[PDB]
Specification:
The structure is cut from a larger assembly and holds chains A and B.
Chain A: H1 21-25
Chain B: H1 41-52
Classes of the chains: A little secondary structure, B mainly alpha.
Protein name (chain B): Portal protein B
Subcellular location (chain B): Virion
Subunit structure (chain B): Homododecamer. Interacts with the terminase complex composed of two small and one large terminase subunits.
Chain lengths: 48, 53
C-alpha cells in the first residue's frame, strides 16, 4: 500500500586496522601437540 | 614437522607439465590415493607379534 520508490547506490563495509606483526616476525613455526602439557628446556653452557 | 609450504602450479601457462600426479581411483571423488596395505596391515603386525613371542 506504498507507492514511494527507492534506489540503493553504494554500501561499504567498515573495518579497523589489524595486522599481526608480532606473530609474523618472530613466531614462525607451529607445533600441534596432542599431549597434556608442554616442556621447554635450557642448558647452561658455561665451560671453564 | 614441516615449517614452510610453497605453492607449485600443476601445469605452466604454456601447457607444459610442471607437476605430475599418478594414482588409480576407485570411487567417484578421490583427492588422494590409498596404499595397497590396508587389507593386510593388521594381520602382518599380528603375525610379527606371534612370531617374536
Amino acid at each position: 500500500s506504498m507507492y514511494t520508490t527507492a534506489q540503493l547506490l553504494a554500501a561499504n563495509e567498515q573495518k579497523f586496522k589489524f595486522d599481526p606483526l608480532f606473530l609474523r616476525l618472530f613466531f614462525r613455526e607451529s607445533y600441534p601437540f596432542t599431549t597434556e602439557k608442554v616442556y621447554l628446556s635450557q642448558i647452561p653452557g658455561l665451560v671453564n | 614437522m614441516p615449517q614452510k609450504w610453497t605453492w607449485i602450479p600443476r601445469e605452466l601457462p604454456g601447457g607444459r607439465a610442471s607437476f605430475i600426479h599418478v594414482f588409480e581411483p576407485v570411487e567417484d571423488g578421490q583427492t588422494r590415493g590409498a596404499n595397497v596395505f590396508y587389507s593386510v596391515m593388521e594381520q602382518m603386525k599380528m603375525l610379527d607379534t606371534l612370531q617374536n613371542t
